[PDB]
Amino acid sequence: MIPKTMKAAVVQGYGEPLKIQEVPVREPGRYEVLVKVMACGVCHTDLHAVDGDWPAKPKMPLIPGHEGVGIVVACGPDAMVKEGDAVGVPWLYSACGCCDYCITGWETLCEAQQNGGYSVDGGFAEYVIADSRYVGHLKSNVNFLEIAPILCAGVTVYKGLKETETKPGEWVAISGIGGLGHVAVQYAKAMGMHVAAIDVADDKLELAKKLGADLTVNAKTTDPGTYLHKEVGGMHGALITAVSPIAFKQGIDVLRRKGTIALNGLPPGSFELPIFETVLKRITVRGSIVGTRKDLQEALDFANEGLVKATVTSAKLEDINDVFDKMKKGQIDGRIVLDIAGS
Amino acid sequence: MIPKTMKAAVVQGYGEPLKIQEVPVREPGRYEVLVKVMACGVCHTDLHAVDGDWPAKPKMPLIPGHEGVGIVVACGPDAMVKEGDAVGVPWLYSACGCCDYCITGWETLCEAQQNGGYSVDGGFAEYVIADSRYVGHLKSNVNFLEIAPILCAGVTVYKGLKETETKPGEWVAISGIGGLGHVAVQYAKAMGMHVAAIDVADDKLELAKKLGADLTVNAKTTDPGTYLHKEVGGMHGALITAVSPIAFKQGIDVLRRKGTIALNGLPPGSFELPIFETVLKRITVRGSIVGTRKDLQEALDFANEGLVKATVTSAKLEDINDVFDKMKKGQIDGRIVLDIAG
Amino acid sequence: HHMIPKTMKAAVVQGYGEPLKIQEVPVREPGRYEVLVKVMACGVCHTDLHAVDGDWPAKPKMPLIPGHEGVGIVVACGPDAMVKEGDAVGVPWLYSACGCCDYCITGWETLCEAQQNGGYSVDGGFAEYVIADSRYVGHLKSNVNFLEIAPILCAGVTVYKGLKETETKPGEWVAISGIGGLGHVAVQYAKAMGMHVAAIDVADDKLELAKKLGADLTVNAKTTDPGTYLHKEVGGMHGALITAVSPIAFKQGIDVLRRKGTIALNGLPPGSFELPIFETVLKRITVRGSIVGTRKDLQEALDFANEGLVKATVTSAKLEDINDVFDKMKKGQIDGRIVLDIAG
Amino acid sequence: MIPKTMKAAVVQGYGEPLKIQEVPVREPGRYEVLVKVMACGVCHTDLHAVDGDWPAKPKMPLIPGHEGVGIVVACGPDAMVKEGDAVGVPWLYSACGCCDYCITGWETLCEAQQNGGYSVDGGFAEYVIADSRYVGHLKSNVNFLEIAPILCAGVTVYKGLKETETKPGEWVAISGIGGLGHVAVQYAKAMGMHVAAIDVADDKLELAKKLGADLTVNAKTTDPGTYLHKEVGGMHGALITAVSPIAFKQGIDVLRRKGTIALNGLPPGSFELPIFETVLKRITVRGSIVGTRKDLQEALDFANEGLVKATVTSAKLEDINDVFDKMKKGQIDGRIVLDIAG
Numbered sequence A: 001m002i003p004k005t006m007k008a009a010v011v012q013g014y015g016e017p018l019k020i021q022e023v024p025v026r027e028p029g030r031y032e033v034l035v036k037v038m039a040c041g042v043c044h045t046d047l048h049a050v051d052g053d054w055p056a057k058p059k060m061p062l063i064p065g066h067e068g069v070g071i072v073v074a075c076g077p078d079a080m081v082k083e084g085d086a087v088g089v090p091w092l093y094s095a096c097g098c099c100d101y102c103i104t105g106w107e108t109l110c111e112a113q114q115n116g117g118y119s120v121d122g123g124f125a126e127y128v129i130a131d132s133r134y135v136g137h138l139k140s141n142v143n144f145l146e147i148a149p150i151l152c153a154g155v156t157v158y159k160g161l162k163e164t165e166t167k168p169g170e171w172v173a174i175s176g177i178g179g180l181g182h183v184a185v186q187y188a189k190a191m192g193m194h195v196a197a198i199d200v201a202d203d204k205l206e207l208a209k210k211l212g213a214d215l216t217v218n219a220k221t222t223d224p225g226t227y228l229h230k231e232v233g234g235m236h237g238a239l240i241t242a243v244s245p246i247a248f249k250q251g252i253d254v255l256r257r258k259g260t261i262a263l264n265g266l267p268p269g270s271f272e273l274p275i276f277e278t279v280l281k282r283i284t285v286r287g288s289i290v291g292t293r294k295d296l297q298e299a300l301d302f303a304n305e306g307l308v309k310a311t312v313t314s315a316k317l318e319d320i321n322d323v324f325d326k327m328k329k330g331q332i333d334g335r336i337v338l339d340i341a342g343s
Numbered sequence B, D: 001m002i003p004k005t006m007k008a009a010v011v012q013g014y015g016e017p018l019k020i021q022e023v024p025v026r027e028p029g030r031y032e033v034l035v036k037v038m039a040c041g042v043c044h045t046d047l048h049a050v051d052g053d054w055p056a057k058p059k060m061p062l063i064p065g066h067e068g069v070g071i072v073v074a075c076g077p078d079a080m081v082k083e084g085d086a087v088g089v090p091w092l093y094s095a096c097g098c099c100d101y102c103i104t105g106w107e108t109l110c111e112a113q114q115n116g117g118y119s120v121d122g123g124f125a126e127y128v129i130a131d132s133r134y135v136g137h138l139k140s141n142v143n144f145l146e147i148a149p150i151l152c153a154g155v156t157v158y159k160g161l162k163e164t165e166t167k168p169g170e171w172v173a174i175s176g177i178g179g180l181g182h183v184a185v186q187y188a189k190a191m192g193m194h195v196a197a198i199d200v201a202d203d204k205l206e207l208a209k210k211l212g213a214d215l216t217v218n219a220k221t222t223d224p225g226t227y228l229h230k231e232v233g234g235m236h237g238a239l240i241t242a243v244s245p246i247a248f249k250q251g252i253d254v255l256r257r258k259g260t261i262a263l264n265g266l267p268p269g270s271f272e273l274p275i276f277e278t279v280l281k282r283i284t285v286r287g288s289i290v291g292t293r294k295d296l297q298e299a300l301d302f303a304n305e306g307l308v309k310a311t312v313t314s315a316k317l318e319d320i321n322d323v324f325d326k327m328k329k330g331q332i333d334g335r336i337v338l339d340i341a342g
Numbered sequence C: 001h002h003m004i005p006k007t008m009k010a011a012v013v014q015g016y017g018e019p020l021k022i023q024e025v026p027v028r029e030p031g032r033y034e035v036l037v038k039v040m041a042c043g044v045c046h047t048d049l050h051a052v053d054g055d056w057p058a059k060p061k062m063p064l065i066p067g068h069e070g071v072g073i074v075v076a077c078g079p080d081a082m083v084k085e086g087d088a089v090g091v092p093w094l095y096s097a098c099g100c101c102d103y104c105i106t107g108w109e110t111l112c113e114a115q116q117n118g119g120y121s122v123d124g125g126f127a128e129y130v131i132a133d134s135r136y137v138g139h140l141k142s143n144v145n146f147l148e149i150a151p152i153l154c155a156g157v158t159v160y161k162g163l164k165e166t167e168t169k170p171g172e173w174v175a176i177s178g179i180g181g182l183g184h185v186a187v188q189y190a191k192a193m194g195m196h197v198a199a200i201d202v203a204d205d206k207l208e209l210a211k212k213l214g215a216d217l218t219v220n221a222k223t224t225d226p227g228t229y230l231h232k233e234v235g236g237m238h239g240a241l242i243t244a245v246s247p248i249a250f251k252q253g254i255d256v257l258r259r260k261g262t263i264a265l266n267g268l269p270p271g272s273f274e275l276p277i278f279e280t281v282l283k284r285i286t287v288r289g290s291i292v293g294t295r296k297d298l299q300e301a302l303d304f305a306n307e308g309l310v311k312a313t314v315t316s317a318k319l320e321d322i323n324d325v326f327d328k329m330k331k332g333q334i335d336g337r338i339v340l341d342i343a344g
Ligand SMILES: NC(=O)c1ccc[n+]([C@@H]2O[C@H](COP(=O)([O-])OP(=O)(O)OC[C@H]3O[C@@H](n4cnc5c(N)ncnc54)[C@H](O)[C@@H]3O)[C@@H](O)[C@H]2O)c1
Pocket: A042, A043, A044, A045, A048, A152, A153, A156, A175, A176, A177, A178, A179, A180, A181, A198, A199, A200, A201, A204, A219, A241, A242, A243, A244, A246, A247, A263, A264, A265, A266, A267, A288, A289, A290, A291, A327, A330, A332, A334, B279
């Protein structure tokens, strides 16, 4: 039984507080399913979307959220998942399937893609319309609150770690132990890497140590590049999940020669890439954008096997503005997940 | 018959004019050979050295030159080339052979390497001591003046094009059609790529068209990214050989999604890497530093087969200051090569 | 619009090894995602002969209209078709794929276990009309030469992907073994990819074709041992592509490689060949099967042809002559490719 | 301090029993060191050598052994390790350092290589001459008996696993849980792989399970391809360490589409490669031969961190003939290591 209207956190304009509104519940069309949202992780991208930080703007008005997980309650024609299935609705909400990028295994680069909680309404709501062809597939007995961050934080850093090409037994630095970074530490350990964690607050490094990091460095107390070269001779790879350009520049510093640094974090603007050093050391800098459907299933398998556990605190849908305030202040221990079915 | 003394172009202090001096000729030690220099290409790296543009500084005083080619006239013990061999003395003058990087095929990254015309004296002289294990091997009937740029300009851009991973049938942009860039156009065509050439003067683009470029862009008159995306939907790869940071940023602009841009040019400082675009488009930015001994042989084979031919103008060793002046003001058509033999 | 007849002529095999017969076959209306293509030409692939003879362990449907180098014009569209009436298209081996499995999502739709194969599991281009999945057809330029372009739809895309699968770089040596339908365009793709090319076959006329199409070395394996000759001449191959229909060519393909060489396999004779273990291990030999190409491989392969870098050697035949065509194919008497001129 | 003569296990003719002989101890020449052997692992390659199974024959007479580990007791000129260093002397005893293969990271393919205990005398002796540039470097407090198999069994399967390109979270099959296979199980788990183990005797699969295998298959009782496809849909990769051609054929059977099977085992003869299946499934078959000096250091690091521990039983040098007879009958639990210092 599906209600006619639902509660959803809606933003009207950039930088405005979100407001809980009553929205009509839509019927799914072709390929679509209607998902009853059990939980939805809060990604920093939702904050970038609310604030309009990016040159590519979201739609307005907007229901954010692309870590939404729940149960399929209605299917349109040609749906690829059935009622009762547990699914997640991620950033890569849909792709065309017939372009250069989709056909070659790079559907994350499809120029016709739609983005959940950005170009179409997302999981900050009691129900969400999803394209059944691109949802994450969850086990029926999944813990919705704990699995939610895998739909973006998890798949993103997992794909990012593959993009660094760091091998088992090599060193990777994770810079920014937030929502993305704290699961990045765990994926990297499950991939056989030694892990150095970089942040700017000691409690973030305490989280990394709990989750398996072999080294921790507070960039405000210690220059990361000098410290990691001194300790172990520099990193084979690095993954930048931080929201500050200076972390990107320091990420270059921590690499040994032929290192590869993958970029997830999306602050506005640029960082200075030192040319001489990048050339003489054969540094590779590579942007990495969420993950394909195959990346997503692989990332979920790591969580299903207990190798990756997101650190989660539940919040109510109505408190989303307080969640964004804590996020702006760096006060979140891992991820906040909205418990939408719980209250 | 080897002289005790020789003429050499020597720099004494940064930014100072070079002077032709009489310097001693050394006898080669273990693994070393003494090479009689027939020609030596003038690389912009030589200018960065004499000006001290880089944070890692050269020795001072310094004989520059790492595009030197000539004939072996004396061998130290355990030399790996013989008297009469035609050889080249490149930037990767020597490497340790036993580190992580040398063992895995990346001897260009050896942290114990020595660099010709930078950390050791180079080819701006009548004779040069070389490590016989790292010289380029030339055919006995080589044209020394024409082959000289392959020893750095050639091997560098050839390896750089490999580092872009651009495939046959894909588009590469070459930025800066100078010493490196004008042979990069030719390697790229020989590797099956379509080639877009970018520079800031029309005569550089005329050279590129002459050498096979399919598109040309004067970045001063036309935004490279806008034009190449409009014309062909953007580049699969780019190779930056230019000496200005903005060329690196415009190099990012011209790429399509999943493009890879390889960096050769070595201007001082940094360029602004746009984070959002690099992430959402899966852009790969990769530094590329000369080439291994295997890269160098491959680069020479392309030249020997007539697929790549450097555009060369000779100058006398005493004219090196005039050469650098033309280089600073961008008036060299391809490469200058010092005709040290005659 | 186009006046589509209720029946058409098609070359049909009723049982394995039997001669094909021109039959009056009903013309089908396209369903969802489907289009009806009026066939202008269809290349004859040796796979069509393996299909008619039932050579393979995975059997075709029977009865069967062969042909997966069919090219023509769309004359009818089903619902949700992805090409429109009047478009020039080709109907390849990879007739359709699921689009949502592990292989489809990761760039390997040629490995889709739910794929259908043109002229094998579904009726193909040996007919005046063919039903196609509009999502997987090759896209041709409106002014294409249908007879000349047809082999790119399988011979061309296959060897192009195969050459990529060898990982042979510009300036390196590749050997092409079997200068037939696939091999004679493989020579040209390899040259356009900057490779030096050695051609191997067992009849001098095939090596004459390879030389005329750009091969740098030729060897008749009956005249000269290929491995010894190519190691003597240039020190062995960095890569090899086996397009031959005889297992001994696969064994000799191993011989021609230098250390760290990669040999990609296209040819599909029944049975196996002997892989020498000691040699393969000590030399780090890589043997890699290669199966047609993705939609992206196909567009790339067609781009080489459109630019004049690859030109199939083609002789026209009538649909009614298909049995003589197969006879010539069995005796090794085809100079490159035979293409059925169906429109004329 | 160093004797003029030593005991060594020597084979005089193919298939003959080895005899313990008194042989002179040699002085190390240039680049060479003399190693006092603490232990030496027994590799099936040693048995292939003694029996002359391979078309490339060893030197005769021969001291086998290329898992020898010990202490440097004397250095020739230009030695790269010092007296007192703990080292191992592997299959890749020396390489040229200047060919196509050495320069590109593939020194295991060097056509000028010498092979320890095959083309030069090896570790089945109280002392062994080694090339100081190619020895494995061991920690001073190493357990010599337990580390010895890493010098060939360990580095070989570690490199072989890299050659399969199996990723963390994917399935690899290890075929043959012997000297190589039982450490292959451990490297694969440390590389994040799920592991299926295949052999022809239940005790070999018990060893695999104790060392971390997730699935085991007795190929004599159960078809591996049928079982592994039914259980998990086939393997992303396979590593063949077995000594019988049928294991190679069955290794093909267990792969899913786009699987890669790497070959370590070196039985004489060939195996039947099914052409249709290899093509339609895009199967990659890849030979893999020991590992480079970098591979070797990486493999030792896994052992030093406790992620890989060889299953070892000590034997005396005089027992080598019964060790080979146990090897022929498949009765070795992992590796036998000659305890030479004891
Ligand atoms: N590329 C992708 O596919 C993708 C996907 C999801 C999120 N993101 C982006 O990743 C970024 C992080 O997202 P999140 O949800 O993890 O955010 P978050 O707010 O949970 O955590 C950010 C972390 O960065 C740390 N940090 C700040 N300055 C730092 C510095 N100088 N050095 C090191 N660490 C520093 C903070 O202490 C904090 O731990 C955002 O920009 C988001 O938009 C990208």
